Amino acid sequence: SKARVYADVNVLRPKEYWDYEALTVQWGEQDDYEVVRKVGRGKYSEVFEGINVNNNEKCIIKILKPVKKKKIKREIKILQNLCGGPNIVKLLDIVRDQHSKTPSLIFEYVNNTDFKVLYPTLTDYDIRYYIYELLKALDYCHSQGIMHRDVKPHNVMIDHELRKLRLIDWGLAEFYHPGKEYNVRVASRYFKGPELLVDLQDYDYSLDMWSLGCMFAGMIFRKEPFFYGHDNHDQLVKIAKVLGTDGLNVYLNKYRIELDPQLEALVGRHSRKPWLKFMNADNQHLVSPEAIDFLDKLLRYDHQERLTALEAMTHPYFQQVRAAENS
Numbered sequence: 002s003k004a005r006v007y008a009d010v011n012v013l014r015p016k017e018y019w020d021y022e023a024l025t026v027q028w029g030e031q032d033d034y035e036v037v038r039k040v041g042r043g044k045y046s047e048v049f050e051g052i053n054v055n056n057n058e059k060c061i062i063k064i065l066k067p068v069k070k071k072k073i074k075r076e077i078k079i080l081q082n083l084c085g086g087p088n089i090v091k092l093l094d095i096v097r098d099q100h101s102k103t104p105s106l107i108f109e110y111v112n113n114t115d116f117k118v119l120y121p122t123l124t125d126y127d128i129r130y131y132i133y134e135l136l137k138a139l140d141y142c143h144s145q146g147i148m149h150r151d152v153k154p155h156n157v158m159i160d161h162e163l164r165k166l167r168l169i170d171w172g173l174a175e176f177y178h179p180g181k182e183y184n185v186r187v188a189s190r191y192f193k194g195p196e197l198l199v200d201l202q203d204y205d206y207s208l209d210m211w212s213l214g215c216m217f218a219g220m221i222f223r224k225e226p227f228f229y230g231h232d233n234h235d236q237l238v239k240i241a242k243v244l245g246t247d248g249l250n251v252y253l254n255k256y257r258i259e260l261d262p263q264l265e266a267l268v269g270r271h272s273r274k275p276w277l278k279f280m281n282a283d284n285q286h287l288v289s290p291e292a293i294d295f296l297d298k299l300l301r302y303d304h305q306e307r308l309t310a311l312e313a314m315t316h317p318y319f320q321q322v323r324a325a326e327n328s
């Protein structure tokens with residue numbers, strides 16, 4: 002398997018572009034940024050709203066926990082490669098505490114509204130608009146040779162009043178190299194694509210398109226997360242009871258993957274459930290034909306058939322968003 006688009010970006014760019022391990026951090030001043038209040042965390046980070054002491058602008062201070070320095074230089078190299086990209090979080094500075102050498106990443110600040118509270122308030126148009134803005138970021142990172150590998154609502158900051166969106170958290174992101182087998186231990190369980198769940202390691206930018214489809218399904222069907230499994234095996238069973246197991250067996254067969262036998266037993270045999278079955282009167286005003294047609298082309302087992310980010314932006318579902326952008 003190979004990406005259908007932007008497959009040679011790394012292949013043909015100079016080695017320093019993707020050789021993040023040869024990166025040399027020009028450390029900033031740790032005292033320029035002061036913590037104001039905690040806004041998030043993760044297994045390997047503690048995230049704070051900060052303040053730039055020199056100019057009084059808000060910032061994000063992402064203090065890393067001890068991790069191999071390959072993981073810290075990748076993410077910094079990726080952020081440097083994408084800086085300036087549409088809707089791509091801006092990396093402003095990188096600092097260390099002298100005594101422990103604990104690195105902090107400094108980013109712009111987004112006045113975000115938690116997605117579990119913001120999403121349910123979104124009009125039909127807002128959903129169209131925010132996914133379109135998120136699509137810009139994804140087409141731009143893919144075109145620069147990078148897979149995000151962690152598309153999900155926690156990683157999409159939205160200032161609703163400013164209608165600004167930024168794709169944040171490049172901590173799992175990677176350089177796409179044709180043929181490379183990657184670890185499938187990426188993305189959050191609910192947003193993990195079938196390829197990660199059935200061990201197809203030579204995945205590409207289309208893993209982000211499945212994750213985007215998962216976010217979109219959740220927003221139009223008002224069901225977060227849309228595919229709610231308790232562990233990977235179960236994450237695949239949840240997918241199989243929606244998409245059907247016939248599609249799954251075509252996919253497995255095409256790529257020549259045999260399921261772990263018990264996983265196989267667990268998956269069973271399920272009929273494809275049409276998309277309108279999730280329609281209910283709360284989500285009614287969001288689940289039109291174009292929405293289903295768009296969603297249906299993102300949630301395909303075959304990562305090769307999913308729309309590219311560039312194609313999705315031109316889908317008729319986003320026509321009104323595009324016309325507004327033209328003014």
Ligand SMILES: Nc1nc2c(ncn2[C@@H]2O[C@H](COP(=O)(O)OP(=O)(O)NP(=O)(O)O)[C@@H](O)[C@H]2O)c(=O)[nH]1
Pocket residue numbers: 040041042043044045046047048061063109110111112113151155156158169170172
């Ligand atoms: N208000 C606000 N909150 C933010 C901002 N940036 C990050 N956060 C909060 O901090 C959280 C975690 O930071 P993130 O960069 O995603 O996390 P990570 O530490 O690498 N974690 P993970 O890999 O699990 O997603 C975000 O999910 C978000 O809720 C921001 O710019 N503004």
Ligand SMILES: [Mg+2]
Pocket residue numbers: 043155156170
């Ligand atoms: Mg995150």
Ligand SMILES: [Mg+2]
Pocket residue numbers: 043151170171172173
């Ligand atoms: Mg992360």
